Design a protein around this motif. Structure first.
Motif, PDB file in Angstrom:
ATOM      1  N   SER A  57     -73.925 -53.846  47.055  1.00  0.00           N
ATOM      2  CA  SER A  57     -73.249 -54.046  48.322  1.00  0.00           C
ATOM      3  C   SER A  57     -73.687 -52.969  49.310  1.00  0.00           C
ATOM      4  O   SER A  57     -73.772 -51.789  48.956  1.00  0.00           O
TER       5      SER A  57
ATOM      6  N   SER B  93     -66.901 -61.734  48.551  1.00  0.00           N
ATOM      7  CA  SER B  93     -66.533 -61.135  47.276  1.00  0.00           C
ATOM      8  C   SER B  93     -65.129 -60.564  47.331  1.00  0.00           C
ATOM      9  O   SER B  93     -64.336 -60.757  46.405  1.00  0.00           O
ATOM     10  N   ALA B  94     -64.822 -59.855  48.411  1.00  0.00           N
ATOM     11  CA  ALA B  94     -63.701 -58.937  48.488  1.00  0.00           C
ATOM     12  C   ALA B  94     -62.501 -59.497  49.238  1.00  0.00           C
ATOM     13  O   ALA B  94     -61.413 -58.914  49.158  1.00  0.00           O
TER      14      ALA B  94
ATOM     15  N   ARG C  53     -76.161 -57.290  40.337  1.00  0.00           N
ATOM     16  CA  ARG C  53     -76.529 -57.987  41.560  1.00  0.00           C
ATOM     17  C   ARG C  53     -76.943 -56.928  42.565  1.00  0.00           C
ATOM     18  O   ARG C  53     -76.579 -55.757  42.409  1.00  0.00           O
TER      19      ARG C  53
ATOM     20  N   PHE D 188     -60.951 -47.974  40.542  1.00  0.00           N
ATOM     21  CA  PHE D 188     -62.348 -47.919  40.963  1.00  0.00           C
ATOM     22  C   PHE D 188     -62.930 -46.614  40.450  1.00  0.00           C
ATOM     23  O   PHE D 188     -62.199 -45.654  40.194  1.00  0.00           O
TER      24      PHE D 188
ATOM     25  N   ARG E 283     -71.744 -61.567  52.097  1.00  0.00           N
ATOM     26  CA  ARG E 283     -71.431 -61.559  50.673  1.00  0.00           C
ATOM     27  C   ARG E 283     -70.271 -60.624  50.365  1.00  0.00           C
ATOM     28  O   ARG E 283     -69.454 -60.917  49.490  1.00  0.00           O
TER      29      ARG E 283
ATOM     30  N   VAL F 262     -67.089 -60.769  40.128  1.00  0.00           N
ATOM     31  CA  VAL F 262     -67.394 -59.486  40.766  1.00  0.00           C
ATOM     32  C   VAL F 262     -66.444 -58.399  40.277  1.00  0.00           C
ATOM     33  O   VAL F 262     -66.861 -57.289  39.918  1.00  0.00           O
TER      34      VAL F 262
ATOM     35  N   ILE G 296     -72.067 -51.896  51.775  1.00  0.00           N
ATOM     36  CA  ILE G 296     -70.927 -51.141  52.272  1.00  0.00           C
ATOM     37  C   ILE G 296     -70.170 -50.497  51.105  1.00  0.00           C
ATOM     38  O   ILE G 296     -70.030 -49.271  51.058  1.00  0.00           O
ATOM     39  N   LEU G 297     -69.720 -51.295  50.127  1.00  0.00           N
ATOM     40  CA  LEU G 297     -68.933 -50.735  49.017  1.00  0.00           C
ATOM     41  C   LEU G 297     -69.752 -49.756  48.184  1.00  0.00           C
ATOM     42  O   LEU G 297     -69.241 -48.709  47.762  1.00  0.00           O
TER      43      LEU G 297
HETATM   44  C1  LIG Z   1     -62.415 -53.563  46.895  1.00  0.00           C
HETATM   45  S1  LIG Z   1     -63.767 -53.829  48.068  1.00  0.00           S
HETATM   46  C2  LIG Z   1     -65.037 -54.909  47.359  1.00  0.00           C
HETATM   47  C3  LIG Z   1     -64.795 -55.630  46.203  1.00  0.00           C
HETATM   48  C4  LIG Z   1     -65.768 -56.470  45.678  1.00  0.00           C
HETATM   49  C5  LIG Z   1     -66.981 -56.586  46.337  1.00  0.00           C
HETATM   50  C6  LIG Z   1     -67.209 -55.859  47.501  1.00  0.00           C
HETATM   51  C7  LIG Z   1     -68.529 -55.997  48.238  1.00  0.00           C
HETATM   52  O1  LIG Z   1     -68.762 -55.305  49.266  1.00  0.00           O
HETATM   53  O2  LIG Z   1     -69.373 -56.825  47.816  1.00  0.00           O
HETATM   54  C8  LIG Z   1     -66.237 -55.029  48.026  1.00  0.00           C
END
Ligand SMILES: CSc1cccc(C(=O)O)c1
Ligand code: HEM
Ligand SMILES: [Cl-]
Length: 393
Positions: A79, A231-232, A76, A282, A227, A165, A81-82
């Motif tokens: 993200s 997700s998170a 997908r 992670f 999103r 996810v 940010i992540l």
């Molecule tokens: C653990 S933080 C996290 C987890 C899953 C998705 C995202 C995202 O930013 O989409 C962030």
């Protein structure tokens, strides 16, 4: 020099009982090589904390799952940010920080606490409940979709999408490939709720879109930041609260201490996050050759961080396998560490605190009274079902 291990940290036998294999990973060396997936691994607190706190060398923009975005296409869109590094990460992070801010917590606390008290009162009328479906899932479902500003229809997509996810960070095993096979309807719903007209005024989602005129993010970046929260922000808290209830069920002495001082609620939840570590693992990807704990790691190599293992490393923690609600938990990595440290941690902690507060004031005992069933996920640790009888105080 680097020990090679055949342990599969994404196998069902591992998920079923990770702790012996995590000790094996810690004691083999500060840096191991996992032949099953051709990745480096770090399972001790020191190296996990070091890797988290060097985002330049151990980047996130090549993905924080097994897949390397320079080699494969993300399942997908990444993200913002992540799966971003500084400086691209910095301003989206700032926006989510202000959206999920102390002031926002002040706005939602009283309502989050009423729903937590109401839920515990309701469960006490049933006596025998499933602390997962009826509590760990029900309570976040009763506050978080509303706090986001989501419509009522289609909320049943939220937990399946999040499970997908987190499974997708894993290797291409059956858990991941089956999740992606079933993904189409959940992605459709989620991407649609991310659009500004579908997010109710005052909620987190409308607040992200209202932050698109400051020079930090543009309007086309807001749907993906919404999103991120969809997700998170739900499945993590479900497993965090479930972990806390499971801990109080397994350590009755700590429930008794919690009852005698309900102001321990917030630290009791934090300790549950350390003790179970709902987000287990992670990855990072090396941007250069790097020496880590005496080991030379080349450029473009995936590094698996065992967050749960670092939270149980006896090199860092006294009696790490004990659940202790008065433990000084500062420095645990259950929410990560450094520039990516959970931007939603205030929401998580608020939810966990008010739920454990309600339990502390209203419940005298939590006794498992049925078969415990584990939920398997490539990234999340938690239970599928936790049958308990609640005895009222
Ligand atoms: C653990 S933080 C996290 C987890 C899953 C998705 C995202 C995202 O930013 O989409 C962030
Ligand atoms: C007990 C509950 C939770 C746990 C255990 C948890 C865990 C984590 C961890 C370990 C990270 C770091 C990821 C990394 O370093 O790559 C993280 C980041 C993040 N979390 Fe949480 N989280 C929880 C709750 C939440 C909630 C409630 C929200 C939103 C409302 C949220 C949103 C995010 C986001 C957007 C990020 C990415 C931050 C960044 O990359 O700068 N999380 N979380
Ligand atoms: Cl998606």
């Amino acid at each position: 020099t680097i020990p090679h291990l055949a342990i599969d940290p994404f196998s069902l036998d591992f998920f079923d009982d990770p702790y012996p294999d995590q000790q094996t990973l810690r004691d083999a060396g500060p840096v191991v090589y996992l032949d099953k997936w051709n990745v480096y691994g770090v399972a001790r607190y020191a190296e996990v904390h070091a890797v988290l706190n060097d985002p330049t060398t151990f980047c996130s923009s090549r993905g924080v799952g097994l897949s390397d975005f320079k080699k494969e296409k993300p399942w997908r869109p990444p993200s913002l940010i992540l799966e971003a590094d500084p400086p691209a990460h910095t301003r989206p992070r700032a926006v989510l920080s202000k959206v999920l801010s102390p002031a926002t917590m002040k706005t939602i606390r009283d309502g989050f606490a009423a729903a937590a008290d109401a839920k515990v009162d309701e469960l006490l009328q049933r006596g025998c409940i499933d602390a997962i479906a009826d509590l760990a899932e029900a309570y976040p479902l009763s506050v978080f979709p509303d706090a986001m500003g989501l419509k009522q229809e289609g909320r049943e997509h939220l937990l399946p999408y999040a499970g997908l996810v987190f499974n997708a960070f894993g290797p291409p095993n059956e858990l991941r490939q089956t999740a992606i096979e079933r993904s189409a309807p959940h992605q459709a719903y989620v991407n649609e709720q991310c659009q500004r007209p579908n997010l109710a005024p005052g909620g987190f989602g409308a607040c992200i879109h209202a932050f698109t005129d400051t020079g930090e993010i543009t309007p086309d970046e807001a749907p993906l930041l919404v999103r991120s929260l969809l997700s998170a922000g739900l499945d993590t808290t479900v497993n965090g609260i479930g972990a806390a209830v499971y801990c109080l069920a397994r350590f009755p002495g700590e429930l008794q201490r919690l009852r005698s001082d309900p102001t321990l609620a917030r630290n009791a939840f934090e300790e549950a996050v350390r003790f179970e570590s709902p987000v287990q693992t992670f990855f990072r990807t090396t941007t250069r050759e790097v020496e880590l704990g005496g080991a030379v790691i080349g450029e473009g190599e995936k590094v698996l961080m065992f967050l749960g293992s670092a939270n149980r490393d006896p090199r860092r923690w006294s009696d790490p396998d004990l659940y202790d609600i008065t433990r000084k938990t500062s420095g645990h990595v259950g929410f990560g560490s450094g520039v990516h440290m959970c931007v939603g941690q205030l929401v998580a902690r608020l939810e966990g605190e008010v739920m454990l507060s309600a339990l502390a004031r209203k419940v005298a005992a939590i006794d498992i009274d049925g078969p415990v069933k584990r939920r398997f996920n490539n990234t999340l640790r938690g239970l599928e079902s936790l049958p308990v009888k609640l005895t009222p105080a």
